[PDB]
Ligand binder design. Structure first.
Ligand SMILES: O=C(O)Cc1cccc2ccccc12
Ligand SMILES: [Ca+2]
Ligand SMILES: [Ca+2]
Length: 124
């Protein structure tokens, strides 16, 4: 679920504040997305967006309000290590891995201040 993804980021990148840092970054980090990502970080977000897309299109999963963000899994954090609980059902595991892969990705992408709150009507 959304809150848990926020905590994943705090786990992968300890000195970080997610809502502020990664929301409305580039073209994909934020609600929806458009165009080509600008950045490796932005790419991390596009892949996340696509991961949620695929999850919605697993005909065996029916998320509340049709939003995968709505779905909790369990997962733990041990010194930069995110671990998805094996006991999460197939749909929760999938979402879990979207979030975790995205937090691992964010932790290795260059953060470019330029791109925070990008003019998306122009550059995306
Ligand atoms: O996925 C989204 O729609 C927005 C979104 C994207 C990336 C990181 C985030 C961190 C905290 C809250 C929202 C976030
Ligand atoms: Ca997005
Ligand atoms: Ca759940």
């Amino acid at each position: 679920a959304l809150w848990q993804f926020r905590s994943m980021i705090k786990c992968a990148i300890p000195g970080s504040h997610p809502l502020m840092d990664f929301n409305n970054y580039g073209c994909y980090c934020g609600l929806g997305g458009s165009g080509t990502p600008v950045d490796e970080l932005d790419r991390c977000c596009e892949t996340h967006d696509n991961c949620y897309r695929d999850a919605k299109n697993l005909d065996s999963c029916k998320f509340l309000v049709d939003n995968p963000y709505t779905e909790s899994y369990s997962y733990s954090c041990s010194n930069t290590e995110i671990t998805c609980n094996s006991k999460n059902n197939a749909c929760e595991a999938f979402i879990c891995n979207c979030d975790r892969n995205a937090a691992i990705c964010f932790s290795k992408a260059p953060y470019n201040k330029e791109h925070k709150n990008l003019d998306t009507k122009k550059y995306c």
